Every structure is written in structure tokens, then in C-alpha cells.
Design an enzyme around this catalytic site. Sequence first.
Site, PDB file in Angstrom:
ATOM      1  CD  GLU B  69      -0.192  23.250  -3.178  1.00 35.80           C
ATOM      2  OE1 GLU B  69      -0.705  22.423  -3.958  1.00 35.80           O
ATOM      3  OE2 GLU B  69       1.036  23.432  -3.168  1.00 35.80           O
ATOM      4  CG  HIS B 294     -12.731  -8.592  -0.118  1.00 40.62           C
ATOM      5  ND1 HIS B 294     -11.461  -8.927   0.310  1.00 40.62           N
ATOM      6  CD2 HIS B 294     -13.466  -9.725  -0.039  1.00 40.62           C
ATOM      7  CE1 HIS B 294     -11.436 -10.202   0.642  1.00 40.62           C
ATOM      8  NE2 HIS B 294     -12.640 -10.709   0.438  1.00 40.62           N
ATOM      9  N   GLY B 300      -7.741 -14.724  -5.842  1.00 37.80           N
ATOM     10  CA  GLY B 300      -7.596 -16.091  -5.349  1.00 37.80           C
ATOM     11  C   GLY B 300      -8.196 -17.125  -6.292  1.00 37.80           C
ATOM     12  CG  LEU B 317      -9.271  -7.098 -12.342  1.00 29.69           C
ATOM     13  CD1 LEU B 317     -10.172  -8.207 -12.872  1.00 29.69           C
ATOM     14  CD2 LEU B 317      -9.656  -6.749 -10.922  1.00 29.69           C
ATOM     15  CE  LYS B 853      13.576   7.650  20.327  1.00 26.92           C
ATOM     16  NZ  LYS B 853      13.043   9.001  20.749  1.00 26.92           N
ATOM     17  N   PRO B 854      13.771   5.694  14.254  1.00 25.23           N
ATOM     18  CG  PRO B 854      14.476   3.563  13.832  1.00 25.23           C
ATOM     19  CD  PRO B 854      15.009   4.925  14.148  1.00 25.23           C
TER      20      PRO B 854
HETATM   21 ZN   LIG Z   1       1.956  22.096  -7.141  1.00 22.42          ZN
END
Ligand SMILES: [Zn+2]
Lengths: 952, 953
Positions: B69, B294, B300, B317, B853-854
Site C-alpha cells: 500500500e 443497543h 439510560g 461502558l 464550499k462547506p
Molecule cells: Zn501506513
Amino acid sequence: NNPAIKRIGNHITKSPEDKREYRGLELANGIKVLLISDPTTDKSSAALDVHIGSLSDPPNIAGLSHFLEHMLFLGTKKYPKENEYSQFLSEHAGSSNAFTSGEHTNYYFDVSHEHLEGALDRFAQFFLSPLFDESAKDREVNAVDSEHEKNVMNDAWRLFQLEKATGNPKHPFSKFGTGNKYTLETRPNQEGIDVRQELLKFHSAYYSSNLMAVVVLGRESLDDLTNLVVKLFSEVENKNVPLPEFPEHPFQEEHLKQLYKIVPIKDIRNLYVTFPIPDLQKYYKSNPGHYLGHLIGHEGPGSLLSELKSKGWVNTLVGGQKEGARGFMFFIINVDLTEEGLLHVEDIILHMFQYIQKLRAEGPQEWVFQELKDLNAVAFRFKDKERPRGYTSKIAGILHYYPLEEVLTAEYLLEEFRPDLIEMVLDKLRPENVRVAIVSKSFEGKTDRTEEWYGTQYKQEAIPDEVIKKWQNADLNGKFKLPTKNEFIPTNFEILPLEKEATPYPALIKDTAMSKLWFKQDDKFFLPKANLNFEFFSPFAYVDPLHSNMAYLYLELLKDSLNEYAYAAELAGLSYDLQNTIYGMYLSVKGYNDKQPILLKKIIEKMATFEIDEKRFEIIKEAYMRSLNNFRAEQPHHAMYYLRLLMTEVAWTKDELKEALDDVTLPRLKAFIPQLLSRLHIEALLHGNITKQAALGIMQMVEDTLIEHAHTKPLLPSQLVRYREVQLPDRGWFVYQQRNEVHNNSGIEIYYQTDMQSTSENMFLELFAQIISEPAFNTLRTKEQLGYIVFSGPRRANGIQGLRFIIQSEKPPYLESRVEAFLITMEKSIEDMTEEAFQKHIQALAIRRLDKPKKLSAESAKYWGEIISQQYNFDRDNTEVAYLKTLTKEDIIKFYKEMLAVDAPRRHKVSVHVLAREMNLSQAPALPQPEVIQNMTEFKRGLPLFPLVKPH
Amino acid sequence: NNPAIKRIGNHITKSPEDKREYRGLELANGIKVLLISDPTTDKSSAALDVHIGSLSDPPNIAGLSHFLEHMLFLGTKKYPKENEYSQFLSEHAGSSNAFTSGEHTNYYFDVSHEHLEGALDRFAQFFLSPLFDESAKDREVNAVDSEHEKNVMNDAWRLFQLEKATGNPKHPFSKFGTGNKYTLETRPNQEGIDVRQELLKFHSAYYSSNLMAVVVLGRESLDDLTNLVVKLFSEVENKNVPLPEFPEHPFQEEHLKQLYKIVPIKDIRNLYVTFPIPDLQKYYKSNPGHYLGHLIGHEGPGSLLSELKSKGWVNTLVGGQKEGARGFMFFIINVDLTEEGLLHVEDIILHMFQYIQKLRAEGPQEWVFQELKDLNAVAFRFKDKERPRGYTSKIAGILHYYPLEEVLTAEYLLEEFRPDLIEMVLDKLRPENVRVAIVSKSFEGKTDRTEEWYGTQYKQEAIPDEVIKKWQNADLNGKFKLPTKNEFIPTNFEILPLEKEATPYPALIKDTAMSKLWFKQDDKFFLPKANLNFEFFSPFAYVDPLHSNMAYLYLELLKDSLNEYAYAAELAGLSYDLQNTIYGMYLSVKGYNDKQPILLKKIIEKMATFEIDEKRFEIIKEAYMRSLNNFRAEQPHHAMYYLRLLMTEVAWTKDELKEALDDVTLPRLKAFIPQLLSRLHIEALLHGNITKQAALGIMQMVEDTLIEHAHTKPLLPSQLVRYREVQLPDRGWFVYQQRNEVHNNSGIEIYYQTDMQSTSENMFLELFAQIISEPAFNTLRTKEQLGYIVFSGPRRANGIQGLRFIIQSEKPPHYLESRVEAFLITMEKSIEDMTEEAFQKHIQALAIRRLDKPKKLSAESAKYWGEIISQQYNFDRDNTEVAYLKTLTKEDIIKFYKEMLAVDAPRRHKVSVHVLAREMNLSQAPALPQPEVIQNMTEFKRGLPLFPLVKPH
Ligand SMILES: [Zn+2]
Ligand SMILES: [Zn+2]
């Protein structure tokens, strides 16, 4: 003996410790003279006091005697050059000044001890043939008029003159003393009088030798100072003037039991109780007035002040005998009022009479008098050596009142206890002969009378009989005690011998994370005294408006609660000063070194465990609010203030401080304190009659009390910084402007920033300052009459320096072009001044910088400077003067062209303009248009800050 | 028909807000291809993903496929200059990168939209004729070895390899991905390998067209893009390579029930619980993994994290499916540990199984599936437009996994509710096949094994058999309940009409002592979102190191307190970032504007009526202590940190904060808060789907809430201090030197300070920065191989600026200096030699970079927020500055270099920070002055002027 000396004074009772050498004498012509021979003095000095003053002005020319005083500087028959006098004095490291009271005109000077003869000759001529030049009289009348305008809106004078204007008008007490343009020029011209003549008549009539006393101090032997005085003063004429007595008191039957209501300029509340009395001066030996002042004035447990303070009616009280003239005096008791106290004036006064009644009930306390005698005796044994100039003037003043042999001792010692006299004066303090004056903004609009000279708004009532009767029946009150036996009289005065390991300058002798301690055992003065100075750094003292506020209130309330205790200490010649700084706190303790630890321990202890009192807190806060607000009513040089604000990195404004004051709530302050104390560094300088290891133990206890009661831990090194000056751009020029809503005169500081302080950069500046000094006064004040206050000299702050000009004026700040025009005049002046002229100045600066310290605290301040300025250069004066002596006319000029001149590559210039309430001669240079400063913080933000100075 | 194409795919499903046009097609040689037309884009991009990676490394040349690579960048037959590609990209406003996971090698770039064609050409060649130059191969092997050194002492990498090394060692999974100099040069020379062959052989073997996906995005019509892709990629050879599969799990039934005890570099405390699972990928329409993810991971009321945190044992966690490779996957549940927590691991794991039991006992919940489905459908409908290079890279990856028509929606939308897949995966989270790692300094000394590649100290043990038994026997624990309905789910998505007098940039619509409100309503993106940013000023948060500690602590305990209640909102696509700064506090609320005022209000109320739990205070402090301390394990290029300290007016060090942290008692914090909040000033930018009045009310509501509960009032204008940068002397040069005790590389930052930011000063800097940008990388890394981390560029602080270099290296910094200094002269010469037209290219390249542009609200927001937090308020800066940039000439830049930058510039101002390693031809370097060695940070700063602050606009 000489035919020109009527008598010879010997011996002249002096302090046991005093190594100077006195001989007094009366000349043929009737002048009483004191000569002081000090072979080691750097400055010689002389004074003359004439026993004529304000109270003798002709009634149709108010201020003549004051104006005459202004004129004798402006040239004489032997020395016509209008400023020959004050030029000589500055070319030889000296200074001169004078003052005028009701019965005295006092003139003094000093000078490099080597030219006592020159200066004295020039000076004697004031009393033989002053010129009174017609065209100088025409200029200097303005200087006087300026002097008066300055005072017009000062509340102290408004009041001073108000008293004069509410007694008998036909009495010369009621006279305007200062004089002004109308009294001294406008009105005499209209009235067909010729002022210059009247000067001369006046001078001729009253400046008689039988009415003069002279004091001359130098290195010369007593014998030489003799022929020198005789040579110079024998010629003064003896006109034989009868010495004025004013035997009838200016307050008669009808001037008594009167209440005055008065509008101040500042927001002040004040009560002035005042009783008229016969002239107690002749009983100086027993001094009954002082005895009763000591008691009524006292601030210890059981005092009047205490009860009044405890009822929340007053904060401060002064009381005692007030000077009048030969034949009449006053006894006063003034307090300042709180809000609640203003509502209870009748009460407060009843209390004043209850105290007085207590004293009557117990009768004259001999131990109290004995105590006062022994305190004075010690005060006098170990009196600090005075600065010659002030010394000569004071002494020349009191030769009129005591035999030659007694002048030194006279205003110090007390001799016989005289109960019958205490009892004749006390008997003079009663309801049926009292005058009461209340001063408060709440009389705004309710007044009907305007005082002529100042414009004071007031109203006058008869105090109703019912109220006078109620005060006469004033009984005792078990809250009033006589003072207990003053604890803090120092018994032990041993001077400890000089240690083996002892230095000439302060050594650093403890260097911990918690405290640096500078120490020096006193090697010059040998008195049983010590100076203990401490900074306690904490960022927290000045971090923000609210915090400044609290750092301030905290110390005030502390001082206030401590005051009952510390007062006895202070009377016993052992005192302290404690205030907040930009960096955290300052504490000095000075006096006899004997009870010194006890008081120190009390102060530290007390700050670390301080219970605040709600009621106290509230009064002080309000007073402080008012105090912040009252700044709108100081003088236009205000200019100085804005300059401070503009040039320093952090600086809280009054308006900022007053915004935050509303949100210092009691809990928030309580919370504040232990927070302030939790982390600190302490830099201390302990100087005097203590030993290395004694000092170590001092510093230790200080620390230990803090660690113990407030859990103090050391501060971080990085969290310990000094502040920076703003760095002005090259060729730049800014102007900031405000008005003064109160004085109808204007003000201005002009500031020429130069560079960071160094040996060379300092001496360039100091010497240039030296050269221009008196030309500056002569052009700007004497010739051009720009106003009474004109000033030049160095500005040093946060390690940077520059040149400043200050001026107060009837004119708009214009003032600038005259300062700039002047500046070119100086350029031409240096190019023309001779090498020998130039070396005279170097020598002036030299003698001036190197002048040795006279008392221990003069020397402590000299190291203090070094220590807080964080420069630590204790040998400065020697380095700097040696270097100075190297500078040529050429160098100074170059320095001028580079830094100061209108077109310097490096001219940095700020100008503050305070405009008044309402807003031939050399050529001014064309100036650039300034960038006007619209907003102070914006100014600072868009500019670099200098570096902090490195520690030599 | 077309010979070169096996098929066009059908309509590609997109969000209906997605204005981009899309064609999927499969080429003749098997390349799966997505084509994006966006006629509006400023940069174009393409990406190629090859379904091969380091799992397929030869077993005797580890890292070869990572290393391949690296090497495709340095030359092909058609474009053989070693750096043709990276240079062509720099000169035309492009960037580029690559990565290598276990099974993928992914290559992406972007460029000026005008030059997609020439960029792409250069890039296709990576897959046809890579040269692998013998002399480049030799040099670049050092880039890999650097890459690895950097990872040696970092803890995440260590753990990553350690899991790989305690699976089955006979398994591909056990391989070592990165490679280093030893494995890629040393070991292979010893064993007589020609690496250039093995690179050539591997590429030829595996970079086969049947294993490639390509995504290309440009302004070009969809047809034009088709013609382009066919042209450049039809000739990729198809070797019909069987795609590798890994059916057998590396954690077999023998590596299970293991406890591992790990000595970490940083002072951390962590438990990693991990179960092996089948590969869940194919089940993407239902996502049984993510559902239990999930659930277990929920923060919660009534969740696992919730009780564990309550018994003061854990703090954070995570849990859910970790990716494996085709064939295996993992489910994980990891926590960090309090001090108490490390002593209750056994109990903690039981609580985990108790919660799992609950899920088993409740059944699967279709109502939870349903929630999950909508949140996802809503997320996809209103997903922010992505930057093109991230986008193409990403798709290119997922082209392998999903049908063409489904790429855009596959990772998002759910379809099937599968109780049976849930039950199924949930039957595999049992103690009989669990694995447990505790990472803690308290195993230091007590460890009997060393992991070969990173040196990781550890111990291994069978879990006592009746410890298993006890977990198998977990009955339900009443503190544990499934989450209830999620009230924060937005329902109102109405884009408000574009107001009568609205503007292109934020408008200052409120100017009081308490606040400055900057407002702009969305006029580009039209998604039902809004961004709400706030600076709270209080000099009190940074007055001293102690107060700074509290500023911080307070904010963490507050964030911690809210967590349980804010988490709901976060899954609902509504989130907040709250933190302390040198000027007081920063608070951002981002996402669907619908429930946003509910949450903002809860935040302000909480932070102004806060009650501090005594427990959670003691815990967080201990964690914070560690955090400070742990900076001594951060990477040597530390250098950045000491430079921030040396040049700001005011900065407390980690060492001062550490000390002063002991005297933060509970009483003392409780005092701080009300103080801090008593006087404030607020500057805010409210941006998005909100109206003037909606915005004014939000601003007021914040104020009002603080007014009620914290009795807040306005700060005095003068207390609004910005801080300053130290002003260096003309011609000066200072050196600060420190050592990194953990890391065995060294680091350097060199700063040539220039002047205040100003239209002209800025572009002078930026232009030169851009011109030197890749020559710097090319010289200092690729030619000279000084290290993996070579960065140059502008540096902006407190309104001052200048040019910086950061390098991380084996060589000492007294040497790095001289090579940077050498590169500086190489570059004046380059500027001198380059054609006027080569010069204009760079201007254009910077010009385009600046004018991009954004793409999403958050990006436009950021640009405006920079203007504001920095008090320059130059919202139109980009045309002002670009307009001016076009004026500049070679002359100007040469003068600029000679006056500010050259080795004997009259106005060169130089700081260097040298951070030395644990243990301490070429162009011509210039002879240097004698540095001033900075001795004490505070002294250095005391003895120098400070710059002005910048004028606002
Ligand atoms: Zn590398
Ligand atoms: Zn006067």
C-alpha cells in the site's frame, strides 16, 4: 567679642543622641539666629522667618503679604536676573520654597554643602532690596490667582475660610489670606492704588530685623557660620516694628451657640464642634491644651471615639487645641458622620459633653500627664535626624517663641503638671460657648447664604435654648473611662552590637518557596528602632474589580477593629501601616524595636482569624462607595490617573471598582478572606536594631501564624508575576481626553516614553531632566504664566521610564504647543551652554543622587524600592553616578534627537487632556494630528507590552 | 449494448434530500463501480478498495500487504517520477491516503473538480504497472518501521495485537499487520528473499479486478463518468482469485474461559469482556448484533452501565459487535474501572450476565427494533452531505458487501425483525465461552509472558471452574429494566420558510452586557437541524491552576450527572459537547432542532443548580489525576505542547495542575461554582433551521435560567481578556529541551514566527506554506526518511502566526534542525527556478482550498465559529483573502522568504522545541547560530515583549 553680636547662646539643650553641634545668638540688629554645625551633611540649608503674615495685610489689598512672598524670588538689587536665585539653587543641587501663615512668612532653601555661601548671599538679598519688578508683578499675580483657583473647590479651604467669615468681620481674622487677581490687581487698579509701591511700603514697614529669626546649617565650624551670618545679615535694618497682638477673640458673645449648615463639593459628612479659648501658648511649659487633647482625642477602650463608633455614628474623631494667633486659640472636636450619625447630631454632641463632664468629675490625672512627659522625653532622646531644609525652616519658625537655649527642646518636652490650668481650659468647654458646623450634601437647596470668596453654600441658625440646656445637664455615662496605663511604652533600648557576619547592604537570608527575607543590621543610626516590611503576594488581591474591592474592605475593616488596640501602641512610638496593593498586601511596622514582635503577632494573628462585624462592614463599604465617587472632584492633574490607567497592563478604574462594590455582600467577603490567604509568597525586608537570628525568628513567627490559623501553603513560582507597561510605537502620538465636572480649570500630562530602565538609559533621562528642570518652571510658569502647578521630571513605572510634563491651567490643552515650543528652546540651550555649565548639572544630579540617608526609614525606603521594583540593585547610586560622570554634552543631545525632539526616529508620545468644567514669545513647532484614544482597553489591546525588567 | 460493461444496475436508492445523481455498474472484468455526479462539487474524488489485506500476508513476510500500500504511491510505468502522483495532487488542490485492514486495502484521493481526469489517470496506474523501485523500496521500509514505533508504546495498538496473539496461533488472525524493518528488510534478507519480487508477485497474484470496487465523484454527467471509468479500468487484469474466507473462529473452545492480566503503559484500569460469535454481516437487514449492542450498551435508567456506575465500580461502558473478518465476529462488553472496581471484577461480570439473563427472560422486543428502525430511517433521510474523499472511500469499501442498488441504504435502513437471530446470538453470550482481560498497573512485576511484537507484559490463567458456575447461575437482579420509550425521537421535521430580511452570513442580532448573539438561518442545507454554540466568559475558570482544575472537574461531574438522561437524546440524533476553556466554558448543542430546546434547558438548569455527589467527585478526581500524569506517555511530537506553553501569555502546565489538584476539596468546589457563574458574558452563534425570534428566545432562555438560579450578572467589558503571543526578537533563536521518558523516538517542533495575522501577512504565509507543502513531505520523509510523522504548515495562535515543522524521528533533534534548515535553502532555489505558470498553479491550488464550499451545517458553523471565538469577525475572509492572493508574484514570495524565513533573514524569529528519546548522499545544511537555551519557561516569557491583540472587523 564682635560689636555686631548683642548676645551668645550656649549651651543649646539638645538630644543626647544628636551629634550635630549648635550655637545660637542674637545680632546687634535684633535677629535671633541658630547655627547648626554638621560636618557630615551633603546638603547645607538656611531659613528665615519674619513674624509678619496674612493677618497684617492692608484691608484694601487681601493677600499682599502672600504675594510679597511670591515676589522675593523674582530678583534683587545685587542679583537682578529674575531667576538668578532659583537657577543657582538648581545648578548646585538645591531647592527653595516658602509659606505664609497669619503671623509668619517663612522662607527656606537647601544646596550642595560646598556652595552654602553663594546660596545664602543670594537669599539674604530678599531682605535688603527686593526689586519688585513692575513687569514681574504683572505676571506672578496670575501664579497667585492660579493658587487660589486650585483651592476654590477644595473642601478644606472652603471650610477654613468659612470659619473666618462667620466670626467678627472687623477682626483681622476674617481676612482673605491667599489673595487673587481681583484683590491684588483688578480692585487696586480701579481703587486708584499702585500695587508695587504697596509691596515696597509693606516690605519696608514689616520686614524689619527685630521681627526676624534665622537658622543656618552647614558643614562649616560654629565659628565660621558665625562670621558668615554676621557678614550677610548684619545689614538688615531694624525698623523696630511692634509685634502684633490680637487679644480680643474673633468669636464674641453673638458668634456663639451658632449652628452652621454647609454644602460640600465632595460627598462628605462631617461635624465640627469648636470652642473659643484664650491663647494657651504662654503655658507651653505645662501645656494644658495638649493634655485635654490627649484625653478627648483618645481612641482606646472607654474613649469618646469608641462609644460614638460603637453606636455607628462616627468613624474618625480628631480633637485638641487648634492654633490661632498671639492672643486667641480654639479647641476643637471634629468627627466624620455616618448616615445614621447625620440623623443624630444633637445626640453625638450630648455625648461629647458627657465625656467632658466625666473629665470634670474625676479632675486632672497626674499619672496621665507623667505618662505624656516620659513618652515625650523618649521620643526626644531618640528623635530621628531631620532633613536639613525642613529642620531649618521649622526651627527658624519657633525661635520667636522660645529663648535660644530652649528651641530644640521646646516643642518636645513638657515640664510642670498644672492642674489649675487644665481646670481653667476645661471650664472653657461648655454648651453656652460652642459653635457647631454640619457638612452634608443633604443641605443642597436648603441654604440661603453664599460665602464671598469661595462661594460656599451655607445657612446659620441659633442653637435653641432647650438644646443648650439639655447639653449643660449632661451627666456621666458608664461607657466613658479614662485610658488605662499605656501598655506599649518601650522600656528596653539596648542597641545590640554589630554582628561579625554583618553586611553594608541587605543580605537575602531565607529563600524558601514560602518567603524571601532581606535583612540588614543597622550600621549607621544606632537607635533602638526597627523597620519591618512585608509584601504578601497573591494574584487574588487584584485579579478583578470585585476582588480589589474586597482586598480593600478586608484591610480597612481589619485596621478598624484593630484600631482600639493599636492606638496605644502608636502613641508609644511603635506604629504600623497595612494596605492592599496591585500584587496582594503590604504591612510595615516601624518604631522602637522593643514591643515590636507583640504587635506584629497581633496583626498577623488577627488577619488569619478575623471575625467581620456586619454593622462595621456596612459603614465602611458605604464610606468607600462615597470615596470612589468623590474622585470626580479631585484636581485636573486626574491627568496622572488616566495616564496610569493607559500605560499599565492591568488597572481597574474607579467606575469599574464602583460597579462591583454593589455585589460585595457580607458572605462573599467572609468567603474571600481565607481564600486570599490560602496561598501566598512573602518578601520581607527587616532593617534596624535586630540581629540575623532575631530576624529569622521574626519571619518564622509570621509564617507560623499563617500556616497555623489560615493553613497557608506556598504559591507557584510562575503564578508570581509583575505587570507590564504598554509599548508605544515609534513616531506615534496618542491623546486621550476627559472633563472634570467640578474644577473650572484644566489639566494635562504629556508623556515621552523612552526605553526600559538600565544604568545608561536611566542617566541619559535623569540628566536631561536635571538640565531642563528649572528652565521648564521658568518658561512655563514664571514667564508664560500657564498656571500655578507646572512640573517636569522622570516617570518610572513597571520598569519602563519616560519624561513627563504636568500642568494645571486656566488655558486649554495649546498647553501642548507651549511645552513643545519650550522643548526646542532647550535644544538651542544645550547647543550653546558651556562645558563648565554642563558639568555643573552633572555635579548637581551627582550630589542629589548620592546624598546619604539621614534616618533609618529613609534608607529602608531606598532598599524597599530595589526590592519591590524587583531590581535588587542595592549599590545603584554608586554605579549610576560613576557612569553619569562619563556623559558629554554630545551624548545628551544625541539622546534628545533620537527620543524626544519633535521628529525623533523614536519619539513615543501620550498626552492626557483634562478639560475644564466649561471648555511676544517663542515659536511652537507644527505637530502631527494625533490618533485620539476612544476607548482605554481598546488602546491597550492594539499595542505591544514591554518585557519585565531583569534582576541585576 | 457495451462489451466493456457486464451490467448497469437499476435506480440506486438515495435519501430524497440527496441532490447527487448515481449510477452503479459492474465492469466486464468484475470491478464493482459506483459513480457520483455532483455538478456543484468543488473537489472531485475517487476511491478504490481491493478486497485483499494483511490477513492474506505471506506467513513469512509480515506486513507485506500494508507495505505494498505504501509503495503504490512511489511510481508506475506510465508515471514513473517517484512523486508524480502526490505532486500532481498538491498542485491541483488534492490530498490522498490509504489504509490496510485485515481484508482490505483502500486507496482514496480528492482534487480540484477541473482535474479529476488527470488525477484519476495517474491513480489507475497504481493497479496496472506499479514500479516498486528498488531504491524507493529501500527507503520507504523506514516509513513503515516509523509507523510501527509510533504504535509500539500506544496502549490500544498493544491490546489490539495481544488479542490477535492469544487466539489460535496457527490462524491468519494471529498475524502482525503493520510489519516493520525487521520483518520487511532484515528477516527477508537473511532468508534470501528479493522483496521487490514478492511485492511484484503479491500485486500480480491478488490485485485482480474481480476483487476491486471503485467509486468516482465529479461534476461530469453520469455518462461522462461511465466513459471515464471504462477507459481507465477495463484493462485491469482479471485473475479470478477466490475471495478468502475464514470459517473457523480464532478463539476456539480452547482459548475460551481465559483470564488475561495486562500491564499497560498509561495508568489505566480496564476490563475487556469478549465472546466469539458467528459472522453477522449477512444479517444486515435485521442486525441482531446491533440490537443487543443497543441494549447491553444502553446508558439510560435501569441499564447495566447504570447500576455498575451506582455501585461506584465502572465509569463508561461500550458493548456490541466488534468486527472480525468474513467468517468470525466478536461481541464485546468493555468497561473502565474505578479503584474499587478493580477489586470487584468477579461481581461486575456477574452483573453482566444478570443483565443478559434479563434480556433472555424478556424475549426480543419488536417495539425496540421498531425504534431502532426509525432512528436509522430518519438518520439516512437527513444525513449531512459527506466530504467527497471520505464518501468515495467509504462506498468503495461497502461495494463489496451489498448489492449495487442498496449501497447507500444498506448500512442504515432496517427491514426484518428477527427474534430468532436475536435469541440465536444471545445464546452465545454465556460464561462457557467468555474471555476476560484486566489491564492494570497492579500486575506490574507479576506477569510471566511477553508479546513478541509490542513487548506487552502479561499473564494467562484458566478461570476457576466454579467462578464460571457462579456466572452461569445468575438470576435476574431487580435494578435492571429495558429502557422505556424514547421521548427524544424527533417528529417535527419542518424546514421553516426562508425569512423576509435574512442574510448570507451571521448577523449580530443582540448586543447586551450579558450577551452577543450571532444568528444565521440555514440557506444552503435545508435539513431539520440546527447548531447552537455558546462561549461563557469568566476569567475565574483559568485564574490559577487550582481554579482551572475546578472549572474542569465541575464540568465533568455535570456531564456525568446528565449522562443517564442525555443519552436518550443522543441516540435520538441530538447531542451536546460541554467543556472548560482558558476563558471560561464552551457549550455546543447540535442536531435535529425539534427537541433541542428541551435539552439545552436541562443543561443550563443543571449547571446552575448543581448538586455534587460526594462519591462521584472522589472518583472523577482520581481519574483526572491519572489523566494528567498519563500525558508523560503521549507521543514525543509533547513538542507541540511545550510550544503552546512557551508562546501564550498564560498557560498552566500539567505539572502545576497536578500539584494544585490536591487542594481541591469538596467544600472548595461547592464554593467555586456559584462564584464562577455569578458574573459571565455570553457570545453565541445560533445557526440552522431556526427563525430570528426562535433564536432570540433560546438566547434569552439561557440568560434567564442563569439569572434565576445563579443570580448571574454581566461581566465588565474590560474583564473580557483574550491572551497574547510572546514576541520574539529579530534575528533570535531559542531552544527548549525536554525528554520523553516512555517513548523511544524523539520529536521536534520548529517555529519561524512571522507577524500578526492580516490580509497580506496571511496569504504570504499560506502561499509559501502551500508551495513548500509536499516538497517538505517528499524531502523530509520520502527521500530522507527522517520519520513517519513529517508535517509542515501554518501555525495560528492568539492572532499571531508563522511557519512550523513537526517531525517524529529516530535521529536526534540537533540533526533534524539541520535537515529542515537544508530543506529551507532547497526551497528558495525551487521558488527561483519555477515557471511563472507553475507559480500560478499553486495560487490556484490554495485559492480552491480556501473557496471549498462547506457540505454540511456543522462545517459552515465551524468557519463562522472561528471568526467569532477569535474575535476577527471576518465572515467574508475567503473572498477578501483569495482576491488578494491572486495579486501576489514570485518577487513577493522571494522577498517574503528573505526577510522573514531565510537563515540570515533580518527578521527571522525562531523557536525550536527538542524532545529527546527515552534513551538519549544529501543536500547541504547551512551553518547555524548558537541557540539560546531556554532554562525556565516563566523566565523566558517574562523577558520578552508581547504582541498586540488583532483588531476586529
Ligand atoms: Zn501506513
Ligand atoms: Zn503661594
